[PDB]
Design an enzyme around this catalytic site. Sequence first.
Site, PDB file in Angstrom:
ATOM      1  N   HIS A 461       0.818  -1.213   0.000  1.00  0.00           N
ATOM      2  CA  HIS A 461       0.000   0.000   0.000  1.00  0.00           C
ATOM      3  C   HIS A 461       0.856   1.269   0.000  1.00  0.00           C
ATOM      4  CE1 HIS A 461      -3.580   2.430   0.750  1.00  0.00           C
ATOM      5  NE2 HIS A 461      -2.966   2.988   1.780  1.00  0.00           N
TER       6      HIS A 461
HETATM    7  C1  LIG Z   1       4.646   9.685   6.672  1.00  0.00           C
HETATM    8  C2  LIG Z   1       4.255   8.235   6.707  1.00  0.00           C
HETATM    9  C3  LIG Z   1       4.095   7.554   5.505  1.00  0.00           C
HETATM   10  C4  LIG Z   1       3.730   6.211   5.505  1.00  0.00           C
HETATM   11  N1  LIG Z   1       3.577   5.559   4.303  1.00  0.00           N
HETATM   12  C5  LIG Z   1       3.222   4.226   4.271  1.00  0.00           C
HETATM   13  C6  LIG Z   1       3.069   3.581   3.047  1.00  0.00           C
HETATM   14  O1  LIG Z   1       3.254   4.188   1.992  1.00  0.00           O
HETATM   15  N2  LIG Z   1       2.712   2.249   3.013  1.00  0.00           N
HETATM   16  C7  LIG Z   1       2.501   1.556   4.187  1.00  0.00           C
HETATM   17  O2  LIG Z   1       2.179   0.368   4.139  1.00  0.00           O
HETATM   18  N3  LIG Z   1       2.650   2.194   5.406  1.00  0.00           N
HETATM   19  C8  LIG Z   1       3.011   3.529   5.461  1.00  0.00           C
HETATM   20  N4  LIG Z   1       3.161   4.182   6.680  1.00  0.00           N
HETATM   21  C9  LIG Z   1       2.932   3.437   7.971  1.00  0.00           C
HETATM   22  C10 LIG Z   1       1.435   3.254   8.226  1.00  0.00           C
HETATM   23  O3  LIG Z   1       0.763   4.477   8.010  1.00  0.00           O
HETATM   24  C11 LIG Z   1       1.145   2.746   9.639  1.00  0.00           C
HETATM   25  O4  LIG Z   1       1.890   1.571   9.878  1.00  0.00           O
HETATM   26  C12 LIG Z   1      -0.338   2.442   9.859  1.00  0.00           C
HETATM   27  O5  LIG Z   1      -1.080   3.645   9.841  1.00  0.00           O
HETATM   28  C13 LIG Z   1      -0.556   1.720  11.188  1.00  0.00           C
HETATM   29  O6  LIG Z   1      -1.928   1.539  11.465  1.00  0.00           O
HETATM   30  P1  LIG Z   1      -2.485   1.720  12.964  1.00  0.00           P
HETATM   31  O7  LIG Z   1      -3.982   1.515  12.949  1.00  0.00           O
HETATM   32  O8  LIG Z   1      -1.813   0.787  13.944  1.00  0.00           O
HETATM   33  O9  LIG Z   1      -2.135   3.247  13.343  1.00  0.00           O
HETATM   34  P2  LIG Z   1      -2.968   4.489  12.744  1.00  0.00           P
HETATM   35  O10 LIG Z   1      -3.518   4.189  11.368  1.00  0.00           O
HETATM   36  O11 LIG Z   1      -2.066   5.695  12.711  1.00  0.00           O
HETATM   37  O12 LIG Z   1      -4.147   4.737  13.813  1.00  0.00           O
HETATM   38  C14 LIG Z   1      -3.881   5.407  15.027  1.00  0.00           C
HETATM   39  C15 LIG Z   1      -5.036   6.327  15.395  1.00  0.00           C
HETATM   40  O13 LIG Z   1      -5.296   6.252  16.783  1.00  0.00           O
HETATM   41  C16 LIG Z   1      -5.644   7.529  17.273  1.00  0.00           C
HETATM   42  N5  LIG Z   1      -5.273   7.694  18.694  1.00  0.00           N
HETATM   43  C17 LIG Z   1      -4.022   7.936  19.199  1.00  0.00           C
HETATM   44  N6  LIG Z   1      -4.105   8.029  20.546  1.00  0.00           N
HETATM   45  C18 LIG Z   1      -5.391   7.852  20.916  1.00  0.00           C
HETATM   46  C19 LIG Z   1      -6.017   7.848  22.161  1.00  0.00           C
HETATM   47  N7  LIG Z   1      -5.391   8.338  23.228  1.00  0.00           N
HETATM   48  N8  LIG Z   1      -7.379   7.629  22.219  1.00  0.00           N
HETATM   49  C20 LIG Z   1      -8.109   7.421  21.063  1.00  0.00           C
HETATM   50  N9  LIG Z   1      -7.478   7.428  19.834  1.00  0.00           N
HETATM   51  C21 LIG Z   1      -6.138   7.639  19.759  1.00  0.00           C
HETATM   52  C22 LIG Z   1      -4.922   8.530  16.385  1.00  0.00           C
HETATM   53  O14 LIG Z   1      -5.705   9.687  16.200  1.00  0.00           O
HETATM   54  C23 LIG Z   1      -4.705   7.780  15.086  1.00  0.00           C
HETATM   55  O15 LIG Z   1      -5.560   8.271  14.078  1.00  0.00           O
HETATM   56  C24 LIG Z   1       3.526   5.526   6.702  1.00  0.00           C
HETATM   57  C25 LIG Z   1       3.688   6.212   7.906  1.00  0.00           C
HETATM   58  C26 LIG Z   1       4.051   7.558   7.913  1.00  0.00           C
HETATM   59  C27 LIG Z   1       4.214   8.254   9.232  1.00  0.00           C
HETATM   60  C1  LIG Z   2     -15.482   3.850   4.671  1.00  0.00           C
HETATM   61  C2  LIG Z   2     -16.128   3.237   3.422  1.00  0.00           C
HETATM   62  C3  LIG Z   2     -15.412   3.649   2.123  1.00  0.00           C
HETATM   63  C4  LIG Z   2     -14.035   3.476   1.975  1.00  0.00           C
HETATM   64  C5  LIG Z   2     -13.411   3.846   0.781  1.00  0.00           C
HETATM   65  C6  LIG Z   2     -14.120   4.405  -0.291  1.00  0.00           C
HETATM   66  N1  LIG Z   2     -13.517   4.768  -1.463  1.00  0.00           N
HETATM   67  C7  LIG Z   2     -12.197   5.002  -1.711  1.00  0.00           C
HETATM   68  C8  LIG Z   2     -11.078   4.886  -0.868  1.00  0.00           C
HETATM   69  C9  LIG Z   2      -9.839   4.586  -1.453  1.00  0.00           C
HETATM   70  C10 LIG Z   2      -8.695   4.427  -0.671  1.00  0.00           C
HETATM   71  C11 LIG Z   2      -8.792   4.561   0.712  1.00  0.00           C
HETATM   72  S1  LIG Z   2      -7.367   4.365   1.694  1.00  0.00           S
HETATM   73  C12 LIG Z   2      -7.328   5.769   2.791  1.00  0.00           C
HETATM   74  C13 LIG Z   2     -10.019   4.854   1.313  1.00  0.00           C
HETATM   75  C14 LIG Z   2     -11.155   5.018   0.522  1.00  0.00           C
HETATM   76  C15 LIG Z   2     -12.072   5.320  -3.010  1.00  0.00           C
HETATM   77  C16 LIG Z   2     -13.259   5.335  -3.609  1.00  0.00           C
HETATM   78  C17 LIG Z   2     -13.494   5.669  -5.106  1.00  0.00           C
HETATM   79  N2  LIG Z   2     -14.548   6.688  -5.331  1.00  0.00           N
HETATM   80  C18 LIG Z   2     -15.740   6.034  -5.925  1.00  0.00           C
HETATM   81  C19 LIG Z   2     -16.954   6.967  -5.792  1.00  0.00           C
HETATM   82  S2  LIG Z   2     -16.723   8.546  -6.709  1.00  0.00           S
HETATM   83  C20 LIG Z   2     -14.987   8.961  -6.260  1.00  0.00           C
HETATM   84  C21 LIG Z   2     -14.039   7.743  -6.250  1.00  0.00           C
HETATM   85  C22 LIG Z   2     -14.175   4.974  -2.620  1.00  0.00           C
HETATM   86  C23 LIG Z   2     -15.697   4.849  -2.836  1.00  0.00           C
HETATM   87  C24 LIG Z   2     -15.503   4.571  -0.112  1.00  0.00           C
HETATM   88  C25 LIG Z   2     -16.147   4.197   1.072  1.00  0.00           C
END
Ligand SMILES: Cc1cc2nc3c(=O)[nH]c(=O)nc-3n(C[C@H](O)[C@H](O)[C@H](O)COP(=O)(O)OP(=O)(O)OC[C@H]3O[C@@H](n4cnc5c(N)ncnc54)[C@H](O)[C@@H]3O)c2cc1C
Ligand SMILES: CCc1ccc(-n2c(-c3ccc(SC)cc3)cc(CN3CCSCC3)c2C)cc1
Lengths: 488, 488
Positions: A461
């Site tokens: 991703h």
């Molecule tokens: C700049 C960047 C680029 C990245 N690019 C990629 C990529 O290209 N491909 C890839 O595979 N991975 C990528 N990653 C890594 C990936 O985004 C993470 O590994 C992934 O988001 C982890 O999922 P998670 O649900 O564990 O954490 P998250 O998706 O970050 O979910 C954590 C959430 O919990 C919430 N939270 C925090 N504390 C609390 C609390 N106290 N109470 C309630 N909610 C709280 C926060 O608001 C946050 O939204 C990237 C990371 C960064 C920083």
């Molecule tokens: C939470 C439920 C959900 C999640 C993802 C999408 N999504 C997403 C989507 C793609 C990637 C992510 S990763 C952050 C999340 C959502 C893309 C698209 C494509 N969209 C079709 C309708 S007109 C404009 C284009 C859609 C419809 C929709 C609903």
Amino acid sequence: MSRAYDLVVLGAGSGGLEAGWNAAVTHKKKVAVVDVQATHGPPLFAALGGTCVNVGCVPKKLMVTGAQYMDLIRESGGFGWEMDRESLCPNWKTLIAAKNKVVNSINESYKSMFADTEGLSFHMGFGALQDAHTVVVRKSEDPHSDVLETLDTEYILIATGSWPTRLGVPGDEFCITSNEAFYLEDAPKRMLCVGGGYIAVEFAGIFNGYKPCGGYVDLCYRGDLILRGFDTEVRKSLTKQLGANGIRVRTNLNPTKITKNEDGSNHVHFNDGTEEDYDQVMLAIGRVPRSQALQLDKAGVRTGKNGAVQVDAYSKTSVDNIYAIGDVTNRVMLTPVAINEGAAFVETVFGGKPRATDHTKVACAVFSIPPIGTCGMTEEEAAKNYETVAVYASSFTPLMHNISGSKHKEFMIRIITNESNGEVLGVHMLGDSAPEIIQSVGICMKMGAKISDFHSTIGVHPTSAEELCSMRTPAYFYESGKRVEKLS
Amino acid sequence: MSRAYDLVVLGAGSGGLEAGWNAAVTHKKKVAVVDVQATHGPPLFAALGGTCVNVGCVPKKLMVTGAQYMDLIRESGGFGWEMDRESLCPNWKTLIAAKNKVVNSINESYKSMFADTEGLSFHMGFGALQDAHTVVVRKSEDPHSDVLETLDTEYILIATGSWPTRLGVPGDEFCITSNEAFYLEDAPKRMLCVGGGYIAVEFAGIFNGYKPCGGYVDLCYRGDLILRGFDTEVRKSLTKQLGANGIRVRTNLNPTKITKNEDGSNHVHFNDGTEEDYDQVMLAIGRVPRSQALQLDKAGVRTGKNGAVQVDAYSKTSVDNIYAIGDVTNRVMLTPVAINEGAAFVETVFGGKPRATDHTKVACAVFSIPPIGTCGMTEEEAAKNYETVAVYASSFTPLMHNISGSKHKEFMIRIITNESNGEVLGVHMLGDSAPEIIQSVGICMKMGAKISDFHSTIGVHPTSAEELCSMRTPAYFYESGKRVEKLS
Ligand SMILES: Cc1cc2nc3c(=O)[nH]c(=O)nc-3n(C[C@H](O)[C@H](O)[C@H](O)COP(=O)(O)OP(=O)(O)OC[C@H]3O[C@@H](n4cnc5c(N)ncnc54)[C@H](O)[C@@H]3O)c2cc1C
Ligand SMILES: CCc1ccc(-n2c(-c3ccc(SC)cc3)cc(CN3CCSCC3)c2C)cc1
Ligand SMILES: Cc1cc2nc3c(=O)[nH]c(=O)nc-3n(C[C@H](O)[C@H](O)[C@H](O)COP(=O)(O)OP(=O)(O)OC[C@H]3O[C@@H](n4cnc5c(N)ncnc54)[C@H](O)[C@@H]3O)c2cc1C
Ligand SMILES: NC(=O)C1=CN([C@@H]2O[C@H](COP(=O)(O)OP(=O)(O)OC[C@H]3O[C@@H](n4cnc5c(N)ncnc54)[C@H](OP(=O)(O)O)[C@@H]3O)[C@@H](O)[C@H]2O)C=CC1
Ligand SMILES: NC(=O)C1=CN([C@@H]2O[C@H](COP(=O)(O)OP(=O)(O)OC[C@H]3O[C@@H](n4cnc5c(N)ncnc54)[C@H](OP(=O)(O)O)[C@@H]3O)[C@@H](O)[C@H]2O)C=CC1
Ligand SMILES: CCc1ccc(-n2c(-c3ccc(SC)cc3)cc(CN3CCSCC3)c2C)cc1
Ligand SMILES: CCc1ccc(-n2c(-c3ccc(SC)cc3)cc(CN3CCSCC3)c2C)cc1
Ligand SMILES: CCc1ccc(-n2c(-c3ccc(SC)cc3)cc(CN3CCSCC3)c2C)cc1
């Protein structure tokens, strides 16, 4: 017995130069390789390197890459790239020039290969058969022209490939083919591509990218949906996206008469009786095997439909010492197929360990804009050959296209499986990177991959390919050839 | 016992929203999902959708795609595309604007998911633990602020992810991270990226594309070669190509003291005792799990080193009803890993069919320019715990780059195999389309692909991926840890 050469290859092509090289290098045999000319050029378009190098894969891809910039420059604007977008048209002259430089550069490296390899000699002219052991090289295609060389060999290999087919309508001679298309002085303003196959679809994309100001490209096909034999949902989405990109797709239409005009342009009569003027008219009717002048009768080599060479699984003709590979056999007309067929030929006659080319489950691509990446059976075909089949489907507009402005660019993946087994029988993709993804898909498929092997793989991703591992629930099923919404 | 909810998810992230959705939809459970805010924004950057959506994968990829146009526009010239190349710089604020529009509409898409799904409810605030069955939602991160909600649950799931780490030097608070990088109103002319990991290398690429006239990006790394744990020949070739593209890679260098000047710019003291001025200085030191504010001690959940939540193979913590997934566990910090970890969690405790995430042989990518696509073991690691390993290698400059002018853009593939059986242990790729190819490579490797499966597959021509099926003889070998040129 003992003669001058071990192998005489007719055609320095993808397959020819594969068998020639391997025999000479790994088995140190004495190999003669006959071809029409040394470097690429108009009079007789094909050369050293075959169609692939000279007037096929290589130059085509470069021109498809060049045309793809039209979209990319437009798409850049949404991301913050500002320039003169006013009547932004490309230089066709400097494309062909750059194209010629590269093609010639490959022409030169094959030339120095012959000088660097002992036992490997190049023989320029028109090769034709005399008997089972003798190949005669002539000055021209006419079998009464001067005899340049008389080659005495143990084995003969025919790799002369294929040639463009023409339709028998009045004014046929005024039309160009893929051959002439590469050496046009100017990009046409009014372009007609006749046919609905690989070449027709690809070149429609090239001309559409390189058309001058206010220009247009019309693709016309005699049938209902273009690219017969591909996934129908992919074909439909491709027709829609070529339309959106500028190409006017024109189905159930075929030329019947073509006349030359005084200004230079071509006057075309269609099926519906309409008349139009086109600057250039390309014929992508298909490719017939090039063997009509080789005199296969004089050696006792069987000529099938369209001049195809009757071969068994090991490429062996009706005569035990003569062989044939590539487009001239009319099996699967691709470059890597011919290469495999050549390497297999060497492994058999000079290697001691015989091998046949696996013509099934071969991943190929259509370099349209956007491109197609396919491997395996269509859902129509798999329904006829299997008890019960599951059809997985997924369509999406990538996130970047919400910014770029090309919201028509929909990526599509369709997987066709055997319901009983779970075995993937087909994967069909449409969109950017599709020919790159389909390669390692084909490694899974001849390896005999199941749909469970796909979705159990953790995705990468963000990519377009990660969607392959997110398809679990089938859209619909085929049951004994019948389309059903669920399983009984 | 029956309680208010049967699942409370702390963190609406990639893993969180996976477990939340699935429990509520396929198993019809009552799922509460806690997150800090509803839409992306500076004060506390993460939101609904997690880092992936708000300040990670998605916005990063978009910005990398935009930066990639700098090259493509330059490369178009050789193909015949003429324009004002004089002082061509991009519009940073219209990129950020477009980026925000997309991120926001995903924030909105997730908002209307909660309204349309029964049992699934969103709770805005700072979730923290009270006991094994109670999660308290607070106004602020400060554990003395107002108590907004008190959630009574059967199962707790911790998916709070990770947070940027900072180096303990004077002037630390004047530096930005990946968080602030997304919301800078102006693109820096003088840019320093500190670190040699994913974020450092990717963002150096972004800024390098979006630098104004006469601008420069300096990447500085503490050690000898950037991106530890990756294929060493890939890292070297990346360092060379980031150089060639404009990014000044500076190794064995680390900041020691940073001071803020009166004009706004930052004064940086380095390891070699040099002084330099940068408009912005980003710290890509890495990411520590976000668990300091959750009070895991109150519930008896074991915190390891860095605050990582200690779990078994099934994501189960010290307490039998509390679980943890994603970055907060510090296993494999990727989005699709967290999603799998989440989907498995549901399958276990609510599905009745327990499953653990396969953390091994996971294909990932680095979205640098050019990008990396990797899956499996490095040759160093495979030498440390295998008998004999074969190292296959291939480097090539794609034909189109002879016309485009970017002759530095070398595509690299290196396969690492267990020589005993032929099993592919690692595939490492550098170049365009690499993250797209590596996906379907990871399907092969999960199936346990052998090197014979690769080179027996008929290639797709012309592509960069077809080279994957043309590597047959190894470059060198490792024998019981030692680097050997041949087998004894
Ligand atoms: C700049 C960047 C680029 C990245 N690019 C990629 C990529 O290209 N491909 C890839 O595979 N991975 C990528 N990653 C890594 C990936 O985004 C993470 O590994 C992934 O988001 C982890 O999922 P998670 O649900 O564990 O954490 P998250 O998706 O970050 O979910 C954590 C959430 O919990 C919430 N939270 C925090 N504390 C609390 C609390 N106290 N109470 C309630 N909610 C709280 C926060 O608001 C946050 O939204 C990237 C990371 C960064 C920083
Ligand atoms: C939470 C439920 C959900 C999640 C993802 C999408 N999504 C997403 C989507 C793609 C990637 C992510 S990763 C952050 C999340 C959502 C893309 C698209 C494509 N969209 C079709 C309708 S007109 C404009 C284009 C859609 C419809 C929709 C609903
Ligand atoms: C426009 C175009 C684009 C294509 N693009 C692709 C693609 O992207 N991917 C792909 O996989 N395939 C592509 N193909 C198909 C591919 O080029 C062929 O399948 C491949 O070249 C077949 O190899 P071959 O050795 O059998 O024929 P060739 O490579 O064409 O070799 C035939 C050679 O034999 C020589 N010859 C002819 N007659 C004689 C004789 N009298 N005596 C001695 N020599 C003779 C000719 O000079 C010719 O060079 C394309 C084809 C075309 C026309
Ligand atoms: N892998 C790649 O990227 C490429 C591979 N190739 C190979 O080389 C071959 C070259 O074929 P190319 O010219 O596309 O054509 P191919 O036969 O694919 O396609 C021919 C097209 O022309 C149509 N056609 C045939 N006869 C007539 C006629 N008399 N009047 C009007 N239309 C007609 C056919 O329609 P209908 O379906 O009704 O018969 C078909 O759509 C291909 O078969 C392919 O194997 C070529 C280019 C690129
Ligand atoms: N898949 C993807 O596209 C992405 C994935 N991610 C994930 O998120 C995580 C976020 O961290 P990301 O920035 O890569 O960094 P990660 O820790 O991998 O890398 C940090 C880099 O900073 C260096 N470093 C560590 N500590 C210091 C220090 N005290 N002073 C100077 N330099 C230091 C490290 O060097 P050293 O080698 O010497 O320890 C390493 O090169 C990654 O581990 C990855 O799992 C993040 C972004 C994109
Ligand atoms: C003298 C030994 C030799 C062997 C193979 C090639 N070759 C060939 C090659 C071309 C034609 C044939 S016969 C049809 C054989 C080999 C292609 C390519 C292009 N690319 C280069 C980087 S590694 C991947 C391939 C290359 C490098 C050249 C020389
Ligand atoms: C309400 C029905 C629904 C559910 C999920 C998605 N979704 C989701 C999705 C992803 C993760 C989750 S849980 C973190 C939920 C939904 C992602 C994507 C991205 N997409 C993949 C399919 S083709 C276009 C790109 C999409 C389209 C869409 C609609
Ligand atoms: C056996 C005779 C021979 C060997 C190699 C090439 N070749 C070739 C080459 C390329 C295509 C073909 S046709 C499939 C044949 C040879 C390329 C390159 C350099 N570079 C390598 C990476 S891919 C882009 C070019 C080279 C050096 C040509 C002829």
